[PDB]
Amino acid sequence: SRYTTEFHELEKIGSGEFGSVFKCVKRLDGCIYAIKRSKKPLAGSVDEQNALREVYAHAVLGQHSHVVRYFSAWAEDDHMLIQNEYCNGGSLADAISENYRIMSYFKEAELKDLLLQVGRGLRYIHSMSLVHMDIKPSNIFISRTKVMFKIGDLGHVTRISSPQVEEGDSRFLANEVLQENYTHLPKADIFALALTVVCAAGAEPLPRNGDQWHEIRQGRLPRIPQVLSQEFTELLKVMIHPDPERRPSAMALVKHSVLL
Numbered sequence: 001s002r003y004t005t006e007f008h009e010l011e012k013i014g015s016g017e018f019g020s021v022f023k024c025v026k027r028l029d030g031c032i033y034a035i036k037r038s039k040k041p042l043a044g045s046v047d048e049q050n051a052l053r054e055v056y057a058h059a060v061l062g063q064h065s066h067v068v069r070y071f072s073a074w075a076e077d078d079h080m081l082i083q084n085e086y087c088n089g090g091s092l093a094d095a096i097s098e099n100y101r102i103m104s105y106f107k108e109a110e111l112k113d114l115l116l117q118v119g120r121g122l123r124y125i126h127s128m129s130l131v132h133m134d135i136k137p138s139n140i141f142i143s144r145t146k147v148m149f150k151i152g153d154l155g156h157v158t159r160i161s162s163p164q165v166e167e168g169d170s171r172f173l174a175n176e177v178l179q180e181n182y183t184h185l186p187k188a189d190i191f192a193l194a195l196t197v198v199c200a201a202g203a204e205p206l207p208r209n210g211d212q213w214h215e216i217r218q219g220r221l222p223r224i225p226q227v228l229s230q231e232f233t234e235l236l237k238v239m240i241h242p243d244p245e246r247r248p249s250a251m252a253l254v255k256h257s258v259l260l
């Protein structure tokens with residue numbers, strides 16, 4: 001098995017609907033990698049599509065400091081193995097869960113840093129005529145010594161010119177995408193980033209549907225318990241503006257004054 005030949009497994013660090021993730025050391029270089037193990041996708045299926053969307057995206061983007069690196073992919077028996085860059089701080093979703101456990105939180109300065117760094121990631125991706133289409137806390141990773149945020153899971157990445165949309169998490173999805181309007185897809189990433197920061201700021205779990213869902217797509221920011229500057233709250237608000245064209249672009253977001 002290539003997996004045991006090339007790597008030594010240190011511990012299982014994640015398991016879910018989309019596979020398990022293992023912290024592994026590669027024998028040859030002594031470096032740590034995050035390896036995802038999953039069911040070999042059915043040939044001709046959506047899962048296969050996701051997998052190929054992912055390879056294409058990394059192939060186009062190459063290495064970028066705000067995108068989780070993608071090294072190699074192969075199969076053993078009925079399973080797919082993918083070797084990724086290890087982000088020792090875990091996912092943002094897990095950090096938020098940790099913040100709750102120990103009564104800690106991301107103050108405003110750190111939220112701006114989050115918004116800025118992931119924004120730079122989005123700016124690069126969009127500059128390459130790609131959109132991510134699944135920005136959410138479980139797809140943002142943390143690399144630390146002091147902190148680097150990185151965009152992971154490129155399985156939904158598609159081309160702005162002639163897109164194939166596998167619609168992302170309903171809780172982070174812009175209304176226009178739900179309406180099968182695929183004409184301003186980069187602004188969908190922007191919308192999703194705002195709500196990602198909103199979760200990190202300590203907002204209640206986001207709605208999947210119903211009144212609360214629509215209220216947000218009306219441009220209403222979910223309730224956040226910590227005090228934030230109005231200038232910052234207004235920035236998050238315009239990022240979920242019902243008109244996608246009124247939302248800042250990534251390049252506009254990173255050039256924005258309100259961020260460091």
Ligand SMILES: COc1cc(Nc2c(C#N)cnc3cc(OCCCN4CCN(C)CC4)c(OC)cc23)c(Cl)cc1Cl
Pocket residue numbers: 013014015021023034035036068084085086087088089090091138139141152153154
């Ligand atoms: C959503 O999509 C994808 C997500 C992943 N997942 C990860 C990537 C990536 N990429 C990178 N880095 C990761 C780091 C993780 O944990 C770091 C901290 C672990 N600690 C070990 C020590 N003890 C004491 C506490 C826990 C991690 O854990 C769940 C998952 C990671 C992959 Cl591999 C592929 C896809 Cl497609």
Ligand SMILES: [Cl-]
Pocket residue numbers: 209210211
């Ligand atoms: Cl509904």
